[PDB]
């Protein structure tokens, strides 16, 4: 029973939003609702425009991805009123003009790249913004003092049905043949909650003469940042190593615990983080779902998480055999509402 307001600098405009976040499904997006209030003796322009736009901030310039045009004019040329929308109208009165939005499916989520030590001011990333302004015509310029700029974020949550556990196998032989170097690893589950440990079971046996050096364990986050051309990025968000060695003609089996967190990753430039309202800190932006066989021409940042295990041999000059296990890391389903700020404020 709480709404969000953002008053215009001149005090003649305010936009009411029931929630600041919208759930994105595989092919369905929750519509954006709310009302806008305009005081009398100010609607001489006879045109109220509320626009929802998504832009890619780089460097600076804004590359608009999707732009929505909704007019809240008193004429208002069906759009049935939602229960939340209807409640706002009754409280404010007959001077409130409701507006609605229909975000198309298969769109990038609100993800912002983490700035490096050399701060550049504005945070680079995909941001969704809702703005309302009054003008005689659309082509007329809109002043910041005579408009509001409300920021919203589109987020996704882990599905209620977990998928199959990850599993992959590989075998590499070099110039010696026979006695394959068996290597396989698996994860407890495909979907991992934020902050939950990542446990991987590895089973390595080496019947070859060459020994096995220390095993490298790392978790890599992939950011498919494309705004002009496709360019995949790799970041080792989690990294831990053990000095365990595999003797020839022996079997090795151990479990390694991993935890992705940004406490020690604050100095890693290029990391992808969730939507930031003004300056708050998010937590390792979750993976972006896709509608199975969907086109990969999405102009935005796509986040995917994978687990890579690396084993280096002594070659009697060193060669490595690695098999990568993808996994999913998303937030659970909120009950009441997501707090879009640090709950303990200092």
């Amino acid at each position: 029973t709480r709404v969000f307001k953002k008053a215009s600098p001149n005090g003649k405009l305010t936009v009411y939003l029931g929630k600041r976040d919208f759930v994105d499904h595989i092919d369905l997006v929750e519509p954006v609702d709310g009302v806008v209030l305009v005081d009398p003796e100010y609607l001489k322009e006879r045109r109220v425009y509320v626009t929802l736009t998504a832009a890619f901030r780089y460097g600076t310039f804004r590359k608009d991805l999707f732009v929505a045009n909704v007019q809240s004019f008193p004429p208002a040329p069906k759009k049935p009123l939602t229960r939340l929308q209807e409640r706002l109208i009754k409280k404010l009165g007959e001077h409130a003009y409701p507006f609605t939005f229909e975000i198309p499916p298969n769109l990038p989520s609100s993800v912002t790249l983490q700035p490096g030590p050399e701060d550049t001011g504005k945070a680079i990333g995909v941001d969704y913004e809702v703005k309302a302004f009054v003008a005689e015509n659309l082509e007329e310029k809109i002043h910041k003092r005579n408009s509001v700029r409300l920021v919203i974020e589109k987020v996704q949550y882990a599905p209620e049905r977990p998928g199959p556990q990850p599993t992959a196998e590989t075998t590499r032989q070099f110039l010696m043949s026979d006695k394959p170097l068996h290597l396989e690893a698996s994860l407890d589950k495909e979907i991992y909650y934020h902050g939950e440990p990542i446990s991987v079971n590895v089973h390595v046996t080496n019947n070859t003469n060459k020994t096995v050096k220390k095993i490298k364990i790392s978790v890599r986050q992939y950011a498919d940042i494309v705004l002009f051309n496709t360019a995949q990025y790799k970041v080792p968000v989690a990294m831990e190593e053990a000095d365990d060695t595999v003797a020839p003609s022996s079997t090795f089996s151990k479990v390694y615990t991993l935890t992705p967190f940004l406490a020690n990753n604050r100095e890693k430039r290029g990391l992808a983080l969730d939507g930031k309202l003004k300056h708050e800190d998010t937590n390792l932006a979750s993976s972006t779902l896709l509608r199975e066989g969907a086109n990969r021409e999405i102009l935005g940042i796509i986040v995917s998480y994978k687990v890579k295990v690396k084993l280096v041999v002594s070659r009697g000059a060193s060669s490595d055999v690695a098999v990568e296990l993808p996994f999913t890391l998303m937030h659970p389903k909120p009950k009441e509402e997501p707090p879009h700020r640090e709950v303990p404020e200092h």
Partner: antibody
């Protein structure tokens, strides 16, 4: 889901006492650990908090800098190293637990250790 | 600036089944970061309601919290015989994390 601690021993002014709080059923990076001090017969009071995921440490105004709070991942335990205690410190300390993400108050609380100076 | 929260009812006496209202006035403005905790004599506190409108899992449905402006209040429909305790307010919107003065309830 269960938090156990001992925190026993007589305390003298200008001394130290280390509190060990074992956490089971949950980790530290997804659960911020809070310490609540309650004077015998008075109301509750918050002294310290640790957020290992974000690496943020918070303290009360009256106990700022005096205490030392740290957490470990290998055994999932929360430590509260208090030094140079004053006379107005006789109370019961509770190892409260909350959620690192989607904070919804302190749901799980420790048994409570009596400290007398 | 620090935030100080006061609980108007310090102690009250009631029978089983009456409608008891406990109010809690706040100095500053808190959107929804209000929590109420139950405490038996010599027992660890237990969370009752979070966000001042939601209900915690396992808590009996008789408990209910309402917010009207700044004076957050907790209401109990029926006072069960074992429901006697001391209720403490809490805020988690700022750094101080200030608790209430307590409201002792006895049969």
């Amino acid at each position: 889901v269960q938090l156990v601690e001992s925190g026993g021993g007589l305390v003298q002014p200008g001394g130290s006492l280390r509190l060990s709080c074992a956490a089971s059923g949950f980790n530290v990076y997804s659960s911020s650990i809070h310490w609540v001090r309650q004077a015998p017969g008075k109301g509750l009071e918050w002294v310290a908090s640790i957020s290992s995921y974000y690496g943020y440490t918070y303290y009360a105004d009256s106990v700022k800098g005096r205490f030392t709070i740290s957490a470990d991942t290998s055994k999932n335990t929360a430590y509260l190293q208090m030094n140079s205690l004053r006379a107005e410190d006789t109370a019961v300390y509770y190892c409260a637990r909350s959620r690192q993400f989607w904070y919804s108050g302190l749901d799980y609380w420790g048994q409570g250790t009596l400290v007398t100076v | 600036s620090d935030i100080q929260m006061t609980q108007s009812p310090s102690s009250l006496s009631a029978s089983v089944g009456d409608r008891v209202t406990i109010t809690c006035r706040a100095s500053q403005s808190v959107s929804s970061a209000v929590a109420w905790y139950q405490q038996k004599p010599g027992k660890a506190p237990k969370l009752l309601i979070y966000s001042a409108s939601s209900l915690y899992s396992g808590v009996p449905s008789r408990f209910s919290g309402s917010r009207s402006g700044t004076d957050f209040t907790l209401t109990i429909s029926s006072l069960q015989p074992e429901d006697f305790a001391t209720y403490y307010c809490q805020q988690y919107k700022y750094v101080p994390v200030t608790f209430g003065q307590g409201t002792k309830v006895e049969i």
